[PDB]
C-alpha cells in the first residue's frame, strides 16, 4: 500500500466507525477496534476508562436505525504502519473530537486508543 | 464532496503535485497552485522566495521524464473549504519536507503556500 | 542546535504576538512578524479573497480595538527543521476562524510566510 | 493554564518521557502515564502490547545512566482537554516515530497511550 492508498483505508475506518456506533454494530466494532484498546474521557465531570465491550455496550444501548450520523475528518497522519486521526462526530446529541490512534496489522489498520473530548 | 471525498481529493492533489514536479508540468502545476503562490525555503543558505512562475520555471530545468519519484503523505488535516498537508518528496536528488495549505474554491482544492526544508 | 521545544515556545509566541497586533491593529508588529510578501487568503462575504500584507495590516487597523482581551488557542503546531505550520483558533471582529499558518525560522527568528482562514 | 502553557506543558512532558526511558526512572514514567496507558508497536515482526509496568521494566533494563538522547518533538495537536503528540526518538540504537495520547486531568497531561513504529 501506498500512503495515499492507506489514508483511503484510513477514511474508511472512520466511515465504518461513525456508522457502526450510531447503529450499534457490535462485530463491525469488534473487526477496527483491538480487544486490548481503551476509550478515555472526561463525561459528566467524572474520567471513563471504558474497555471495547463497554465502549461497544454504551453503544448498543444508546443505538438508532434511522439517524444519518454528522461527521468530519479533521486530520489524519501516518508514519509506517501507525497513524492518528482527529475526527469530530455527533453521539447522543452531544458534539465530539475524538482523537484515535491505529496501528496496520496483519493487513488492516485497528484502533489501539481512543481519547475524546466533549464541546 | 463529502468528508472522505474532501481527503480523497486532496491525497489526488499531492500525487499530482509530486508527479507535475517530477515531470516539468506546467499546466498541471498552474492548475493546481494559484497565480499568487509562493515556495519558500532555504537553499544553500540563501532564502528562495519563488512565485509559481518561478516554482514551475524551475521544475521545468530540472524535469524527468522517466523516473518514479519518492513521495509520502504524512498529514492532512482539514477545517471547511481549507487545508494543511505535509508531504516527503525527493527532488533533483534531495529529501524534503513540504508544508502546503490549500483552499477548496469553485469546487477545485488549490494551494496559497508552500514553504519546504531540505533534510 | 535550538530544539523543537524551544521552537515551539517561540512558535507559540509568535502566535500570542499575531493575535494580539491583529486585534489592536498594531502596524509594526504586523509588518514585523509577517514577511513583505505574506499572503493572507481565505473566502469572506462568498468570495476569494487575497490579502497582501499592506491590505490586511489596513484590514486589522480598521477594526482595532484598544481593550478587548480576544480569545485564541493553538489548536496544531508542526515543525520540521526551519518551517512550522500551525492551526489557530481566534475571535476577530465578532467572527471565530480557524487559521492555517505557513512559518519559516530566517535569520534566527521565525515569521509568517501565509495564513489560510475559514469563517466558522 | 492558558494556551501557551498548556503547549509549554506538553513539550516538558515529551523532554520528561525521553529522558524518564534512557535513565529507567521509574518515578518519572509512574507520574507522566497513566496506570491503565498502554505502549503498542511491531517489534521485530510482532506486536508488542505493552503496559505502563511492562514499558517501564524494559526502559530500566536498558537504562543507561550517561546518554544524552536524540530527540525532536514532529507536532503536537490539542482540543480541550485532549492532546495528541508525534515524537521522534532514539532508543537502544534505533529510530522510533512515537504517537502518544494525552490527557489533562486534575492539573496535569499524563498519557493514555504510546504507539510507535521502529524506522
Known amino acids: 500500500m501506498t500512503t495515499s492508498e492507506h489514508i483511503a483505508a484510513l477514511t474508511a475506518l472512520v466511515e465504518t466507525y461513525v456508522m457502526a456506533m450510531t447503529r450499534g454494530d457490535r462485530p463491525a466494532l469488534e473487526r477496527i477496534f483491538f480487544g486490548k484498546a481503551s ?3 472526561h463525561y459528566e465531570g467524572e474520567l471513563l476508562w471504558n474497555s471495547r465491550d463497554a465502549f461497544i455496550a454504551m453503544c448498543e444501548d444508546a443505538a438508532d436505525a434511522e439517524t444519518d450520523p454528522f461527521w468530519a475528518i479533521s486530520s489524519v497522519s501516518v508514519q509506517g504502519d ?7 462526530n455527533d453521539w447522543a446529541g452531544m458534539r465530539f473530537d475524538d482523537f484515535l490512534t491505529v496501528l496496520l496489522h496483519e493487513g488492516s ?3 489501539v486508543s ?3 473530548r466533549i464541546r
Chains 1, 2, 4 share one sequence.
Open 114 to 116: 481512543k481519547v475524546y
Open 82 to 88: 501507525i497513524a492518528m486521526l482527529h475526527v469530530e
Open 109 to 111: 489498520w485497528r484502533i
Open 39 to 41: 476509550e478515555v474521557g
